[PDB]
Amino acid sequence: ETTALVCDNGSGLVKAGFAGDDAPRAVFPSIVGRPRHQGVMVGMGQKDSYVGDEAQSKRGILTLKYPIEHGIITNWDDMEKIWHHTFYNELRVAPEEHPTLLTEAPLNPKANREKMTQIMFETFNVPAMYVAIQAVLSLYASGRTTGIVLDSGDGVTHNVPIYEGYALPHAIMRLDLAGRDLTDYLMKILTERGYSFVTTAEREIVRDIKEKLCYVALDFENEMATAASSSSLEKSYELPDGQVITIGNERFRCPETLFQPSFIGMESAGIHETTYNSIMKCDIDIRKDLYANNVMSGGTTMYPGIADRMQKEITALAPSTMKIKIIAPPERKYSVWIGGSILASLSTFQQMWITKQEYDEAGPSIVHRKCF
Amino acid sequence: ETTALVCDNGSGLVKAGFAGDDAPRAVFPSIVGRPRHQGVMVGMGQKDSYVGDEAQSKRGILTLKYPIEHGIITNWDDMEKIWHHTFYNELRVAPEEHPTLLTEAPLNPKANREKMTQIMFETFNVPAMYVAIQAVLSLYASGRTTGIVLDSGDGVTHNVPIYEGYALPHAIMRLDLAGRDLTDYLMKILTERGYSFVTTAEREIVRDIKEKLCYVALDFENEMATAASSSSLEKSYELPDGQVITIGNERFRCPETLFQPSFIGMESAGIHETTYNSIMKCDIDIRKDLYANNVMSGGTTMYPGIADRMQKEITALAPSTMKIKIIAPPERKYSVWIGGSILASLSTFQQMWITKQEYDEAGPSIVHRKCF
Amino acid sequence: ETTALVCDNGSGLVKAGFAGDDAPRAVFPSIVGRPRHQGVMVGMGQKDSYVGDEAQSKRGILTLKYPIEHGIITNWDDMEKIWHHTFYNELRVAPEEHPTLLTEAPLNPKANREKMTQIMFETFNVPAMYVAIQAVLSLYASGRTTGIVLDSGDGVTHNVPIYEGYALPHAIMRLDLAGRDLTDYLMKILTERGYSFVTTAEREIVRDIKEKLCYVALDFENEMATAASSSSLEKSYELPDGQVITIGNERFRCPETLFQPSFIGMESAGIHETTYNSIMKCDIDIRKDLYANNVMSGGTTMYPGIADRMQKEITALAPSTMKIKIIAPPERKYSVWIGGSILASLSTFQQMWITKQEYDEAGPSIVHRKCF
Amino acid sequence: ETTALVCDNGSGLVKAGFAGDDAPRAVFPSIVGRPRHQGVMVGMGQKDSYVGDEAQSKRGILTLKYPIEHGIITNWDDMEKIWHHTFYNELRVAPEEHPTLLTEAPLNPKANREKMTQIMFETFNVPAMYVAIQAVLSLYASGRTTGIVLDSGDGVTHNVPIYEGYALPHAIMRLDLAGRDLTDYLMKILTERGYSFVTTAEREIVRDIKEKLCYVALDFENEMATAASSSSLEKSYELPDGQVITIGNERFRCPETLFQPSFIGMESAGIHETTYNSIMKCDIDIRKDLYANNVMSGGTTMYPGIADRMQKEITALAPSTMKIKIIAPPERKYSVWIGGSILASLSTFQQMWITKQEYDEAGPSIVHRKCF
Ligand SMILES: Nc1ncnc2c1ncn2[C@@H]1O[C@H](COP(=O)(O)OP(=O)(O)O)[C@@H](O)[C@H]1O
Ligand SMILES: Nc1ncnc2c1ncn2[C@@H]1O[C@H](COP(=O)(O)OP(=O)(O)O)[C@@H](O)[C@H]1O
Ligand SMILES: Nc1ncnc2c1ncn2[C@@H]1O[C@H](COP(=O)(O)OP(=O)(O)O)[C@@H](O)[C@H]1O
Ligand SMILES: Nc1ncnc2c1ncn2[C@@H]1O[C@H](COP(=O)(O)OP(=O)(O)O)[C@@H](O)[C@H]1O
Ligand SMILES: [Mg+2]
Ligand SMILES: [Mg+2]
Ligand SMILES: [Mg+2]
Ligand SMILES: [Mg+2]
């Protein structure tokens, strides 16, 4: 025990590394896949469940299912499997090798974090462990102490404002529109072209289309009228079976959902009015220093041209005299793990762990009160 | 010990300097601010209480509270904090570097001054110290020996008459209507426009509006009828979050309170009948030399057009044959500290100090009888 | 014209009746709902906006929005719609059938009342009309002339002291914490159990949970420790889709906000220190007769066990020698309309109306000065 | 032009009639058959392609092929042939005799509907035409305005929820398991008895077996164990060549696919979890009124004992306190045409047509936006 594990259990992509490094060493999708055909060969009981990286290569014969959705762990036997695969088969370190720094989204059920802690203590027997907040670590990665964080991951999208050290918990805005909800919308708007992706394996193909051809239109209606000259926008993607598909205005109608949540039948406001409505609930004096630091995090905020549309639509709401400046790091996809590597390597933090003794003698309610 | 400290502990703005200078070197608001949110960053026990100048810049996340109100020190742990911040972090001189000349309003409780003295002796260990009267120092600054002093500060407003050297203590008129009481009235008459300032941070924004847009109408009803042509008076102020507000006849209804104390539900007379009623209690011969010298002091008497309204409404009461002349220096805001720099640099005064020895051997009742 | 209309436009629930009756005849929630889906049937332009009672039954496909919030009318086209629905479709009387007695909260913008009057005169053409004060009518319903009124409605909560006939306007304490602000807090503390109500329709379900399962703990910390024996308190509510939910210590953490306004991130004092601080600003002699009559009004003051907690926490502040007695009528929910039925049926009042002639020839500024 | 044509182009059975009638007049299978032998007689070029009813009687020497599959028109020269056979040889009315009301399944490619419209305008020259939705017409036939529609036809099976007028498009669940997919499964499970139907003509014999001997077992495993007493279930069908066959537990293993889509190697859920999962995506308030109206449509939902199994397996999922009631009309096979005869005879609809002028001057994109 000299270094510590930093294991960000994303909603769709598990990242894990060592406290002190500059980038995680174990980045693999958080899937659990079961085989659904008979298996006539002699490999009958041969790996009745694949996890992570293999469950993506052999995904032709597998029903893939995520153990996490919308930040809430819904399948505990698959999450123990994914963890046990991270510690042993990917990081190749014992659990009691180091303390652990897990991460979870804000405003989650009180039972999810307690069950995380119980598993990590009574099944892997970690010496110590601490559960950070995905939106406070995203500032550490940027070396700031003030700003509003839009940490739109893959299962959840949340705004968290933080003045110079002090978080304002009464203004945290959560919203359950994220990357998976855009993949499922791209699966639907693609039928109108003729392509029908239905299975759970085809889902991981539309995810790949989304990550490669989809951009966010700076203005929606102008680009939608530009798609009438139906050649200056269409791109072609090559499926795994050699077939080709051509998507046109589906390139910006998939990520426009984040600004038009009524597309997928949600009565909520875009990520430009859950950031502005969150700044208009902070006290009037810190309102000027939050406009100038909208740090962005999470994978889904990697769409080409999302920082500019945010910066253009917030400035259309905020008073016209002061500065809007979206701070989009180039590595923001890992911006939550990087922060976790920083906070776990600070000397000021080497106290806040929750050790096995302190857990057993204080009950499972000890893990909530460590800073909210 | 060659120079002496002159530390005027105002009711809302602490001023402090060196005996002999021409203007104080340490002018900072007398606030103590506590943080009220959690503070998720590693700065947990990072400055659990801000004082003075910082507690004004970071006032977004702070509950600000004044340790003094109406001249009476109501929170002794905050006043020691503000003093200790004046001596060390602002003047950068040791306490036992010099004697001190404190100041306090007339007719205060007998315990307030005694506790001031006890703190200064047993906690900062000043060599000597003396407590002047805010209304006798305001004449020194003007180089006079006769006149009536209307020292309307921020916590209290008091008239004190003084003939050629001899104060008349039986005519000192105190009144608890001051700058804070006008700020709280501007916070109320502003709702009727729609703007709602409720917090303790917004209080320091309505104070800023008051100090910039508020004037005193020479005649009230005429100006109130002029505000019917609802363009020739309205001004626009820009809040810290870029929003703008437009105040009209609220510009002269906030400081009219001093002449109409029934606005804030007080049964007392304006500052034009607590000066006149104080001259009509002085003996009939000195009554002519007090009309001609109404020196004015204190911050709140900086409203544009207050000297003229005083000079116009007293002359409507006093007998019609003799002169009314309001003497309003251009620097009267510091007129109490300037005087304190004079009286502490006189050779005739270098005796009246109360030294540590003279204090211990005479008890805490030695500090009242040094000239009232 | 023999009887008169009494139409209390609450902040969340419109009540309307006839002057002289014993209880209002038209009590319906003040909502305006728009449809948000396409509407494929032949009912295309079929009721493009529902109001009041229908907009509550069909609230599955509707975005519901209140035209009033915090007593200030923010959407004038919806308020005309709700009025026009009260007069014609609910009371079934013409507007010029009778004069009207509207009601509004104290310390509102000067434009809200003027626009109310302009609408009622130039769009419904009422013969006469008068705007009372929600806290002076709540005494008429009780047959008193002395007492302090805590009229905590659904948009605003205000204390108003009244000695024998004479109101003390310099002590009226307003506070913007009310029923809607508690519903939005119950929407937040319920996520920690797992239930996520996000829409505007689910808001009217958490309102129903609040009105049925929420009580006010006589002592907070004792009950919060009693909720550790996590069976003796939990209740079960059945949602409209047959699902069941179980709320435990959320039953008294929702209405505790009124005594702990820092829960929802407000820097103000509970309704036990905005009543006490309002009595300590009335003159020392009437201070004894206001302690003995804390009449309570408004809907939100119907929580089981709120009168006892008020009576127990004020008595912990007021001097220990005299009587505290909270007067909580059993019908206080309508206590403001009942009073309006009394004052509009008095012979002494049949003068104070503002008739169309008196309005046009005196301008829209005639409606403020009728008793404040 | 006084009446209008209502031509439901099913996926396997074309129905066509007149707007206003009570039942279609032209119900014929939508097949196109080519001869595949030489034809030695003098009838060389004698009807080189048979359509509809003849292509079923002479199906011994014909290769039969459907021009539609899974709702998508895949062979446009055969679909023009089938239409031209409906208008002229079966209805015996000119195309420009009346406007037309076509029908198509939800979530189809955007090109299929546009090509339908282009053909009907530029090749038959209909005066007007409109394309309804197979699941909104199935309610008109029942005289409802609220309910969920399970319109399992012959090429596609889709659930569509509709509250009182307003469809919820974000919850429409499509699934490509239908009657043809059950015929092809009965062609496979029949080999295990010895009977081998391979041709395209034998397909229309296994379809006939399916329509006559197949029922849906109320409970699967119990009936499958009852088929061990291998006499109480077996039925005997007589092929067209006098041979007889005896099918036993193949009677309920063919339609069980709709509840066990993994039989034909599909990773999807039965029609009891694409209805329940569609109600659990509608808003929580309309969830109670959709449980009580599961109107059923389409041919394949005519299996003896399917309404009871649906009503028994949904009630095992939905909360146990409220009502499940499958509304299965006795004529539901035509329930989509009946509705089309109603909507085309309403006065409220006589506007929504798309006339030739309105088409040419607005382009082929005018036909999508007429209500989705
Ligand atoms: N380059 C990209 N462009 C657009 N979307 C992306 C890109 N990379 C990842 N995504 C989306 O973001 C998700 C990954 O986000 P991530 O931050 O890993 O989520 P989590 O917070 O669960 O870790 C993926 O599911 C994918 O849908
Ligand atoms: N230029 C100005 N115009 C109007 N009011 C002012 C102005 N400057 C200060 N004030 C008011 O006067 C107060 C400062 O008065 P000051 O003399 O410092 O009080 P003290 O006697 O406590 O030192 C401030 O609180 C402010 O409300
Ligand atoms: N029995 C009850 N228990 C608790 N809260 C209630 C109860 N009845 C109503 N409320 C709350 O009070 C509000 C109604 O108060 P009301 O006096 O009608 O407001 P207004 O002053 O706008 O008329 C509702 O919004 C509801 O939240
Ligand atoms: N009585 C029946 N029992 C079982 N299946 C039937 C019955 N009648 C028809 N079918 C099946 O339903 C199909 C006809 O359904 P239909 O509603 O005509 O489809 P479409 O939606 O294309 O019109 C046929 O292909 C047949 O397989
Ligand atoms: Mg993340
Ligand atoms: Mg002063
Ligand atoms: Mg009310
Ligand atoms: Mg059909």
Curated annotation (Swiss-Prot), chains A, B, C, D:
The organism's superkingdom is given as: Eukaryota
Which keywords annotate this record?
Answer: Acetylation, ATP-binding, Cytoplasm, Cytoskeleton, Hydrolase, Methylation, Muscle protein, Nucleotide-binding, Oxidation
Q: What modifications follow translation?
A: Oxidation of Met-41 and Met-44 by MICALs (MICAL1, MICAL2 or MICAL3) to form methionine sulfoxide promotes actin filament depolymerization. MICAL1 and MICAL2 produce the (R)-S-oxide form. The (R)-S-oxide form is reverted by MSRB1 and MSRB2, which promotes actin repolymerization. Monomethylation at Lys-81 (K84me1) regulates actin-myosin interaction and actomyosin-dependent processes. Demethylation by ALKBH4 is required for maintaining actomyosin dynamics supporting normal cleavage furrow ingression during cytokinesis and cell migration.
Task: Choose one Gene Ontology CC annotation of this protein and give it.
Answer: lamellipodium
Reaction catalysed by this chain?
ATP + H2O = ADP + phosphate + H(+)
Tele-methylhistidine PTM positions read H70
Q: What is this protein called?
A: Actin, alpha skeletal muscle
